[PDB]
Amino acid sequence: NAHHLDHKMEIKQWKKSFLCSLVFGIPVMALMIYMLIPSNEPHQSMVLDHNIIPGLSILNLIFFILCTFVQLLGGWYFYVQAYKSLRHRSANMDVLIVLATSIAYVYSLVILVVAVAEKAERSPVTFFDTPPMLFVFIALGRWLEHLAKSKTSEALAKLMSLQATEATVVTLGEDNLIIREEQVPMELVQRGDIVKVVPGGKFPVDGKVLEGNTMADESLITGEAMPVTKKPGSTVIAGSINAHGSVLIKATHVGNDTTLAQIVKLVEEAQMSKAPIQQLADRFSGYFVPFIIIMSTLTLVVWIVIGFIDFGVVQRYFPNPNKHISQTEVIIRFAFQTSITVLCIASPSSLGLATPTAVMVGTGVAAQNGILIKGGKPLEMAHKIKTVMFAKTGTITHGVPRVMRVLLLGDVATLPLRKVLAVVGTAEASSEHPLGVAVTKYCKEELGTETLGYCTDFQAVPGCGIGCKVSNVEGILAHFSVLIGNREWLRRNGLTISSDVSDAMTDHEMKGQTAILVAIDGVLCGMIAIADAVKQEAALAVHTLQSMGVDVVLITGDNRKTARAIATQVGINKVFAEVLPSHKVAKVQELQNKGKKVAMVGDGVNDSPALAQADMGVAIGTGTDVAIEAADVVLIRNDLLDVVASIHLSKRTVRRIRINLVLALIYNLVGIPIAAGVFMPIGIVLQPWMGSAAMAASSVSVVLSSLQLKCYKKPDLERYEAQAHGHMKPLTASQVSVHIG
């Protein structure tokens, strides 16, 4: 487990290989620098290059000895990978390395065999010091870029290796009295067991608190910086840290069913859906290396043909025609040096891993603050979103309503205040709507009676209203056809509604207090007020998106007047009201009909068809419920500011996508003419050993450009109302547009 993300074996192997290459690279460095820097009073004027036999200088013998070893002791790895790639129908960078070393060991050996055969008094300059300098600067570069590839998977490494493996289960007799205790392994612990915890221990299972009061912190899991207080009957998370003594819990989710496993599963899969930009960078990177061979070997022919056709062109560029070197023996060597440098300076890895490292670092940084962007396609999608769509219930409001004002409009004598709420409560209890549970709990806490009536013929039409009959209500009396719905609910059954009550119910409707209609047995019993408080983060979340340049729009199933009432409370322009949850897609299909990219800020299971139809889905508030298929962006914390911080961070990751792909093209397209030998007129050309040190400092530089994303402080509140200070205006409902048709 986590060995794929560890990179430990590659680090060990490349460090060992680099240390193995160092012991042979240091002597070549020492000899080259000793020959390079002259002394003021040399002992014998560099005696170390005294020829022993005509053709083979004593320095070239040492270089040959030191290079043959490295050719077959430190270079068989690249030979093996090149052979295994030639077994395939494609190539690799190891093909380039094998070519660059084979040429430098074949031509530089033929040029010395020729000098030995002709018994020349001077041993020519040979390409025998570059293979000892190629591998050190390649092994070091690979070791450093693998080390920098780590610390990109730091989030995944700290998340996967976060859950515990031993849990202290306990058996309770009747009143949590201890029967025995064991430490069951995680591989076989089952749901329903009772697990204790030690002071300072972990909460390894998602479950419910049995008894005892204790606060725990799970900052490394979700991201909050405060220890949440837990009471008997609350929910614990798998991975937290116990603080106060021992608590007893009942297991609910064990194994892959826990949230942390779901988070890891989602993050890992996020880097699988490659964006079309990555697909294009893959299609043009398959035909990249053969382009390098074809274009490099063209230079080798070019220099030779220009030398044999017009040697006088380069004659002025070659300073010293000596007796030991002919006009041809100098053009050939330069042609081969340039040819080797061209295909030894290209860095395909800087173009291959340009995007994936940036995507991985961005996703990992996001996952540390609750933001849980999935897929590579939504990453670049957030760059080109013009319009964002918001939901009302569960996204901008808290989600927990209550009852504020209750009035009676019928007759007090036959419909007293004691049973009018009881009948509607026992009617709505059969409904699962949050309105029903809110009114039922309000009635229970107000009347104080644990009992209720009985409801029959419970007809429930979603989005419009309900109708039923209630009886057996005499239980609370010791201390009836019912139709509940909206304004149009009581029209199609032919029952009138007065105008004053319509004015009365609109009085609280303007204030964001949605008011439900009560009518039992054809009598206008009274009017009921319900509302949900908008989160305090709604004012600034929209204000930034409009400031950033992304259009906003609200969709909601309630009536039109509440839509404008709730729009001004947050500051939206266009709103979609009077929509039943049947379609949810006709609205997206007409925002997207213009050709724009649309993204809905949903709430979870209730908006699955709309989020899937939309290009980007924001599932906010889905605490401990990460498993969502329709949405492509999931937010663990119910924090509306994170919507800003998701697109804000997504563009930054996409910003580094191009930067990495530009440094991978600048380096290649600038590294060719310098290596191609076009800079003889200026007078700067590269020895091949300098063509690999530039490659090592390229792959690391690409990765080090990605690790700069990790130093991303999460913008807290005080930063947000800093750039949003002084320019923000709440628009009235007069400048508000609504749906058409």
UniProtKB/Swiss-Prot annotation:
UniProt-recorded name of the protein: Copper-transporting ATPase 2
Effect of L447F: In WD; decreased copper transport activity; no effect on ATPase activity; decreased localization to the TGN
Effect annotated for changing A238V: In WD; decreased copper transport activity; increased ATPase activity; decreased localization to the TGN
Annotated EC: 7.2.2.8
Annotated consequence of substituting V575G: In WD; yeast complementation assays show that the variant does not rescue iron-uptake deficiency of yeast mutant ccc2
Residue spans, topological domain Cytoplasmic: 82-88, 150-283, 359-658
Summary of subunit composition and partner proteins: Monomer. Interacts with COMMD1/MURR1. Interacts with DCTN4, in a copper-dependent manner. Interacts with ATOX1. Interacts (via C-terminus) with ZBTB16/PLZF.
Keyword NADP found: no
Record annotation: effect of changing S285R: In WD; uncertain significance
Reactions catalysed, as given in the entry: Cu(+)(in) + ATP + H2O = Cu(+)(out) + ADP + phosphate + H(+)
Parent-protein start and end of this portion: 637 to 1405 of 1465
Function: Copper ion transmembrane transporter involved in the export of copper out of the cells. It is involved in copper homeostasis in the liver, where it ensures the efflux of copper from hepatocytes into the bile in response to copper overload.
Family membership: Belongs to the cation transport ATPase (P-type) (TC 3.A.3) family. Type IB subfamily.
Effect of A422V: In WD; uncertain significance
Effect of I263F: In WD; uncertain significance
Outcome reported for the amino acid change (mutating P204L): In WD; decreased copper transport activity; increased ATPase activity
Effect of E629K: In WD; uncertain significance
Effect of V388A: In WD; uncertain significance
Impact upon substituting C455Y: In WD; uncertain significance
